[PDB]
C-alpha cells in the first residue's frame, strides 16, 4: 500500500486559484529547473507547455510568464501586453558578425567612441589598403626587433604618409632577411612608438597579416565578411582564452542594459578548461597588474556592450513585457584591453562545469530579481546585476 495525500486536491485547488488571481502562472519550454524552482518559491504555479494536478486545473488559463530556449517557441505577436517572455521578437543584427560589423561602422551616429578601440577592424579597396599598411607596419616591427633594403624604404614611406608584398611574404613566411636593416632599427622604433598612440590595434594585430576560414595571403583571399585576426592576444599559460560576459536588456527605449558583475574564462589549463572571474583576478595580480580588472577590463566590456546595443538599427518594435539575456565574448590584448569578438542571444545555461553550474544558476535567479521582484519593490536586491545604461 502506497500513501496518498488527502489534501492534494484541496491544496492544488487553493494554490491555483491564488496563482490565477495574483497572475503567477508560468510555463517553461526547455531544461530550466533553476527557473522553475525560483518561480515556485516565489509562489508561482506551472502550466505545462501534485504539480501535474495543478497543471490540469490551469487548462483554460493563459500563463503570465514564458521562459523558453528559443524565441520561436512563442509567437509573441499574439500575447497580451502583460504577458512576459524572455525573448524579444528578433535576436538583433549584432548577434551576427556581419551585422555587428555594419553597425559599429556607423557608431559615430550615436557616440564619439572609436570602434577600432574595442572591435577588430572588419570589412564586408579599403581592405586591400589596410592589408598593405598592415604589411608595412609589420616590417617596421620586424626591423625594430634576402630582400633589398627598398622593402624598408616603402614601409617607412607608407606609415609616414598615413600619419612590396612579394618581399613581405618572403620575410614573414619564407624567412628572408632585409639588406642593411641594421641602419633602420631606430627609425622603425620611432615610427612605431608614434603609431602606438594613434592605432589601438597595433599590438594585437601581430605581424603575419592573418585575417578571418583564415588566410594570410591577399590574393588567395580576394580570389574567394573579412576581419583582422588577433595574432597577439593575452595568454595565460601559453594558451588562448576568452571571457563570456552576460548582460540583460529589459527595454530598448529607453535602452536599458544590466551588467552581470560575474563572468568566466574559457581556455582554448584546468581540466574543465575554465576559470571563475575571481580566479582570473588573482592571476592578473600574480602578473603584477592590480589595475587591469577594475580600471581597464570591466569598464571596457561595459562600454563595448553599450556601443553594440546603441548602434543596433534593425530593432523597430518590441514588447515592453519582453526582455532578453545576451552573452558577449571578449578577448584581451597584452595591455589587458578587452576586444569584442561576438554577441550571442540566449547563451547556454548548461551546467557543463563546476564554474558554469554556479554562475548559470545565479544569473537565472538574478534575472528574475530584475524582471519580477523589481516590479514589487524598486529598491530590492538584484544579485550580481548592475545597471550600466538607461537612455
SS3 for 384?
coil
Same domain? For 77 and 104 the reply is no
Contact in structure between 303 and 282 (CB atoms under 8 Å): no
Same domain? For 244 and 389 the reply is yes
SS3 for 29?
strand
**Single residue among 215, 233, 251 that ends a domain in this structure:** 233
- The C-alpha cell 537565472 sits at 364
Q: How was this structure determined?
A: X-ray
Taking the CA of residue 359 as centre, how many other CA atoms within 13 Å lie in the half-sphere pointing to its CB? Answer: 24
Distance, CA of 54 to chain centre = 40
**Single residue among 203, 233, 263 that ends a domain in this structure:** 233
- The C-alpha cell 513585457 sits at 321
Same domain? For 42 and 61 the reply is yes
| 247, part of any domain | yes
d(CA 9, CA 131): 72
SS3 for 294?
helix
d(CA 139, CA 159): 11
CA distances from 23 to 15, 17, 45, 367, 371 (A): 12, 10, 10, 19, 14
d(CA 322, CA 343): 19
d(CA 1, CA 242): 57
Cell numbers that stand for 38 in this block: 525560483
Distance, CA of 112 to chain centre = 21
Same domain? For 192 and 59 the reply is no
| 303, part of any domain | yes
| 48, part of any domain | yes
Same domain? For 216 and 252 the reply is no
d(CA 205, CA 209): 7
Same domain? For 142 and 199 the reply is yes
d(CA 130, CA 46): 56
d(CA 350, CA 346): 11
d(CA 343, CA 93): 10
Same domain? For 48 and 108 the reply is no
Same domain? For 103 and 168 the reply is no
| 1, part of any domain | no
| 59, part of any domain | yes
CA distances from 73 to 28, 59, 67, 68 (A): 10, 19, 9, 7
d(CA 305, CA 339): 11
Burial classification of residue 326, based on how many CB atoms lie within 10 Å of its CB (0-12 exposed, 13-18 middle, 19 or more buried): buried
| 2, part of any domain | no
- Provide long-range contacts, Cβ within 8 A and 24+ apart, for 42-46: 42/368, 42/372, 43/18, 43/19, 44/19, 45/15, 45/16, 45/19
Cell numbers that stand for 297 in this block: 577590463
d(CA 47, CA 123): 48
Q: For residue 144, give the nearest of 198, 203, 210 by alpha carbon.
A: 203
Cell numbers that stand for 167 in this block: 618581399
Cell numbers that stand for 225 in this block: 565578411
Cell numbers that stand for 149 in this block: 633594403
Report the number of distinct structural domains present in the chain.
3
| 175, part of any domain | yes
Distance, CA of 34 to chain centre = 23
d(CA 220, CA 226): 13
- Could you tell me the residue range of the domain that residue 163 belongs to? 113-233
Same domain? For 32 and 101 the reply is no
Same domain? For 143 and 269 the reply is no
299 has which bridge partners? none
**Single residue among 210, 233, 256 that ends a domain in this structure:** 233
Q: Buried (b) or exposed (e) across 286-325, using 16+ Cβ within 10 A?
A: eeebeebbeebbbebbbbbbbbbbbbbeebeebbebbbbb
338 has which bridge partners? 332
Indicate if the alpha-carbon torsion angle 366, 368, 372, 376 is positive or negative: negative
Q: Please report the DSSP string for 78-134 in residue order.
A: GS-TT-EESS-SS--GGGSHHHHHHHHHTGGGT-S--GGGTS--EE--HHHHHHHHH
Is the bond preceding 254 in cis, omega lying within 30 degrees of 0? yes
Same domain? For 365 and 252 the reply is yes
Same domain? For 48 and 118 the reply is no
CA distances from 133 to 201, 217, 225, 356 (A): 13, 14, 19, 42
Q: Are strands 241-252 and 65-68 parallel, antiparallel or unpaired?
A: unpaired
Contact in structure between 247 and 258 (CB atoms under 8 Å): yes
Q: Where are the alpha helices (DSSP H) in the chain?
A: 8-21, 33-41, 51-57, 97-105, 126-144, 150-162, 165-169, 185-198, 218-223, 277-286, 298-310, 354-368, 374-376
d(CA 105, CA 103): 5
Indicate if the alpha-carbon torsion angle 368, 369, 370, 374 is positive or negative: positive
| Resolution, expressed in angstroms to one decimal | 2.3
- List strand residue ranges (DSSP E) for 213-336, in order: 226-227, 241-252, 255-260, 264-267, 274-276, 324-332
d(CA 364, CA 372): 12
Amino acid at each position: 500500500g502506497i500513501a496518498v495525500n488527502p489534501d492534494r486536491l484541496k491544496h492544488a485547488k487553493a494554490l491555483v486559484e491564488k496563482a490565477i488571481k495574483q497572475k503567477k502562472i508560468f510555463a517553461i519550454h526547455g531544461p530550466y529547473p533553476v527557473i522553475r524552482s525560483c518561480l515556485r518559491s516565489r509562489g508561482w504555479v506551472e502550466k505545462k507547455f501534485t504539480c501535474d494536478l495543478m497543471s490540469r486545473l490551469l487548462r483554460n488559463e493563459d500563463p503570465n510568464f514564458f521562459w523558453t530556449t528559443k524565441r520561436d517557441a512563442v509567437d509573441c505577436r499574439f500575447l497580451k501586453k502583460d504577458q512576459m517572455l524572455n525573448h524579444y521578437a528578433k535576436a538583433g543584427s549584432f548577434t551576427t558578425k556581419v551585422g555587428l560589423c555594419l553597425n559599429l561602422r556607423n557608431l559615430h551616429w550615436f557616440d564619439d567612441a572609436d570602434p577600432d578601440s574595442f572591435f577588430p577592424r572588419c570589412y564586408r579597396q579599403s581592405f586591400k589598403e589596410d592589408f598593405w599598411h598592415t604589411a608595412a607596419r609589420s616590417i617596421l616591427k620586424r626591423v625594430a626587433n634576402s630582400v633589398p633594403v627598398q622593402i624598408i624604404l616603402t614601409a617607412l614611406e607608407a606609415c609616414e604618409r598615413y600619419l612590396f608584398l612579394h618581399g613581405y611574404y618572403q620575410v614573414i613566411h619564407d624567412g628572408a632577411t632585409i639588406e642593411h636593416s641594421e641602419y633602420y632599427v631606430d627609425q622603425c622604433s620611432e615610427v612605431l612608438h608614434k603609431l602606438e598612440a594613434v592605432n589601438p590595434q597595433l599590438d594585437i594585430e601581430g605581424g603575419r597579416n592573418i585575417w578571418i576560414i583564415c588566410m594570410d595571403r591577399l590574393e588567395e583571399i580576394l580570389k574567394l565578411v573579412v576581419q583582422k585576426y588577433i595574432e597577439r592576444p593575452l595568454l595565460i599559460f601559453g594558451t588562448k582564452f576568452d571571457v563570456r560576459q552576460w548582460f540583460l536588456v529589459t527595454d530598448w527605449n529607453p535602452l536599458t542594459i544590466w551588467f552581470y558583475k560575474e563572468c568566466y574564462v574559457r581556455f582554448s589549463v584546468p581540466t574543465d578548461n575554465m576559470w571563475s572571474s575571481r580566479q582570473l583576478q588573482v592571476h592578473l595580480h600574480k602578473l603584477g597588474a592590480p589595475h587591469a580588472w577594475e580600471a581597464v577590463i570591466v569598464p571596457g566590456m561595459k562600454a563595448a556592450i553599450i556601443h553594440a546595443m546603441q548602434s543596433a538599427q534593425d530593432i523597430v518594435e518590441y514588447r515592453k513585457s519582453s526582455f532578453e539575456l545576451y552573452g558577449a565574448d571578449f578577448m584581451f590584448g597584452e595591455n589587458f584591453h578587452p576586444w569584442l569578438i561576438q554577441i550571442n542571444a540566449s547563451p547556454t545555461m548548461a551546467a557543463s562545469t563546476t564554474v558554469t553550474s554556479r554562475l548559470c544558476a545565479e544569473v537565472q535567479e538574478d534575472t528574475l530579481r530584475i524582471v519580477l521582484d523589481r516590479k514589487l519593490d524598486r529598491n530590492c536586491d538584484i544579485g550580481a546585476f548592475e545597471l550600466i545604461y538607461k537612455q
